[PDB]
Amino acid sequence: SFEIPDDVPLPAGWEMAKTSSGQRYFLNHIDQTTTWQDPRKAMGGGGNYQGPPPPYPKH
């Protein structure tokens, strides 16, 4: 139950970013991909997102 701290950066090579301009997601510099969910997640819940997340925006 370790209180989840909202002041803790994402994993390694991660960076919160937004899509072309409207959906917030998390970039992955390790797997060179993006994320509709926050890495600070755990277990599972369910639900669909805005579709498949493309590779974070170049640069």
Describe it.
The structure is a monomer. The chain is mainly beta. It has one domain (1-59). Helix content is 0%, strand content 17%. It has no helices and 2 strands. It has strands at 14-18, 24-28. The chain has a two-stranded antiparallel ribbon with strand order 1-2. It is globular and about 35 Å long. It is classed as signaling protein. The entry lists the keywords Hippo pathway, YAP, LATs, WW domain, PPxY motif, signaling protein.
Helix amount, in percent? Answer: under 10%
Extended strand count: 2
DSSP summary: helix tally: 0
For the CA atoms, what is the radius of gyration?
12 Å
Beta strand %: 15-25%
Counting structural domains, the number is: 1
Major sheet, described briefly? 2 strands, antiparallel
Please write the string of helix (H) and strand (E) elements: EE
Structural class: mainly beta
Query: What spatial order of strands do you see in the largest sheet?
Result: 1-2
Gross morphology is globular
Q: Kindly, what is the distance between the CA atoms of the first and last residues, rounded to a whole number of angstroms?
A: 37 Å
List keywords for this structure.
monomer, globular, signaling protein, mainly beta, two-stranded antiparallel ribbon
Write a brief structural summary.
By secondary structure, the chain is mostly beta strands. Helices cover 0% and strands 17% of the residues.
Describe how the helices and strands are arranged:
Blueprint: E1 14-18, E2 24-28
